[PDB]
Amino acid sequence: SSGENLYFQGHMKAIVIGAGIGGLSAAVALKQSGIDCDVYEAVKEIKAAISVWPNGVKCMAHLGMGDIMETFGGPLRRMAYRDFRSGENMTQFSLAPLIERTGSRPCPVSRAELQREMLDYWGRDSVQFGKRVTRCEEDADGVTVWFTDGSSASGDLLIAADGSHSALRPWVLGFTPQRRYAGYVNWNGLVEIDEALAPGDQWTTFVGEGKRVSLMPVSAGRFYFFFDVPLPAGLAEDRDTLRADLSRYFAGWAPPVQKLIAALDPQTTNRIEIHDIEPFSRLVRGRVALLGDAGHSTTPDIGQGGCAAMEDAVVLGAVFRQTRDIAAALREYEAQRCDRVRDLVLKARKRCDITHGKDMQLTEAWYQELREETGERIINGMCDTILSGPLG
C-alpha cells in the first residue's frame, strides 16, 4: 500500500505511446532514471531526413545515444545561401564557430537510419507494434489505455508521444486543436552527392520568389534535398505529376536546381503540405504527459521538431531522477518545456512567413540581408535557439 517503495524494479511502469523520435527518446530517459517502460506503436511496420542541431545532439549524447549521431550524422561544416537566378553566393561561411559555442557538431541524418538505430538501441523486442491507442483513463491508482485491436494496458505513468495527430492530446487538453496550414508545400528526398549541385560538406540553399531549394549532406555520400513553394493547400499533385510540377515552379532557377529536378526519383520523393498547431499552455494532466509533436507541432523551418522531442525526453528523465511523485514531476516537466516549445513553434512560424513571401517585401528585405551577411548574425541567431535548450 502506502508503504511500497517505488524505486524497486517493477514498482514503476511507464506506458509510452509512439515509437518515433520522442517515444524512443522518452523510454530511454525514463529507463536511465530507473523506470520500466513498455513502448507501444501503432504501425506494424516502419517508415526523408532531419538536421539534428547541437541541442538535439547533446540530448542524444546525454541519453546514451551519442554514437548514433557521430556515426550517421552527415558532414555539415559550412552553409551558403545562393541567388536563384545566377546560382551565386549571396553569403557563405563555416559553422565551426557554432560547434565551439554550442559544444557539438550539427548532425543531418536520414529519418530512416535514425529511426532504425533508435529502435536497435531500445530493442524491437520491447516495442509492441500494431498497437494504436484510442483512449486513456486515469484514477487514484494509475492510468490505463485502450488499443484499436481490443487490448489495453495499465501503468503508473503515461507518455503520449503519438505524433502531430496525437489521439491522446485531446484528453490532456480538454479540446481538439486543429492543424493550421502554413501556406507552403515541401518536396523532400535523398540523392547521391554530386558537386554539379553543391559542396558535399555544405548546407546549400537557393532562395527567391518566396521559395527555396536546399541541400545538406547526410551519411554515406548523400544529399537530403527539399523544395519549398508557397501554394494553396489541396492542389492535384502527387508523385506522378512531381517532376513537371517542380520544373514549372522553378523555371528559370540556376542550372544546379534543374540538375536536381532531373536527378531525383519521384517515387521516393515526398510531397508534404506544411502545417503547425497553435501552442498549448498545457502539456500534462495527472499521470499523462504529451511529448514531441504530440505536445507541440511546428513548421520544420528552423529544424527543431525532432530536436525539441529529444529535449523533452531529457527533461522527462531528469525530473524523475530523484522523485517518484508523478504529479509533481510532470508539473516540473511542463514548467521547463512549455515556454521553450511555444517559442520554438512561433519562431518556426515567423521564419516560415519571412521565407515564403507572406509579405513579399519583408522576404525581399531578408534576401537583401543575405547579400550583406557575413555569417555572424545567422550564427548568433542559431546559437540563441540552440543554447536556449535544456542542456544549454
Cβ distance to ligand FAD smaller for residue 39 or 207: 39
Nearest partner of 385 among 304, 310, 299, judged by Cα: 304
Q: Is 86 annotated as a binding residue?
A: no
Q: How far apart are CA 233 and CA 331, in angstroms?
A: 38
Cβ distance to ligand FAD smaller for residue 330 or 348: 348
Q: Is 34 annotated as a binding residue?
A: no
Q: Is 287 annotated as a binding residue?
A: no
DSSP structure class, residue 126: G
Shortest gap between Cβ of 319 and ligand FAD (angstroms)? 18
Nearest partner of 53 among 159, 203, 274, judged by Cα: 203
One-letter amino acid at 256 equals P
Shortest gap between Cβ of 228 and ligand FAD (angstroms)? 9
Complete edge-to-edge strand list for the sheet that includes strand 127-128: 127-128, 36-40, 13-17, 157-160, 288-290, 284-285
Q: Is 226 annotated as a binding residue?
A: yes
Query: Is residue 89 exposed (0-12), middle (13-18) or buried (19+ Cβ within 10 Å)?
Result: middle
Cβ distance to ligand FAD smaller for residue 67 or 149: 149
Shortest gap between Cβ of 222 and ligand FAD (angstroms)? 15
Please name the residues in contact with 119: beta carbons below 8 A apart, sequence gap of 6 or more.
Answer: 19, 24, 46, 127
Yes or no: say if 25 and 310 are a contact pair by the CB < 8 Å rule: yes
Shortest gap between Cβ of 181 and ligand FAD (angstroms)? 13
Q: Is 304 annotated as a binding residue?
A: yes
Yes or no: say if 25 and 32 are a contact pair by the CB < 8 Å rule: no
Shortest gap between Cβ of 46 and ligand FAD (angstroms)? 8
Q: Is 8 annotated as a binding residue?
A: no
Strand duo 133-138 + 143-147: pairing: antiparallel
Cβ distance to ligand FAD smaller for residue 20 or 208: 20
Q: Is 306 annotated as a binding residue?
A: yes
Cβ distance to ligand FAD smaller for residue 256 or 306: 306
Count of CB atoms within 10 A of residue 101's CB?
14
Shortest gap between Cβ of 242 and ligand FAD (angstroms)? 16
Shortest gap between Cβ of 166 and ligand FAD (angstroms)? 7
Cβ distance to ligand FAD smaller for residue 156 or 293: 293
Q: At what angle do helices 21-32 and 111-122 cross, to 10 degrees?
A: 30
Nearest partner of 366 among 95, 109, 81, 143, judged by Cα: 81
Q: Is 14 annotated as a binding residue?
A: no
Tell me which residues touch ligand FAD (CB under 6 A).
17-23, 40-43, 50-52, 56, 131-133, 161-164, 167, 186, 188, 272, 292-294, 300, 303-307, 309
Q: Is 182 annotated as a binding residue?
A: no
Rounded alpha-carbon distances, angstroms, from residue 131 to 122, 154, 217? 17, 14, 35
Cβ distance to ligand FAD smaller for residue 167 or 329: 167
Annotated binding site for FAD: 22, 41-42, 51, 133, 293, 303-307
Annotated binding site: 22, 41-42, 51, 133, 186, 212, 224-226, 293, 303-307
Annotated binding site for substrate: 186, 212, 224-226
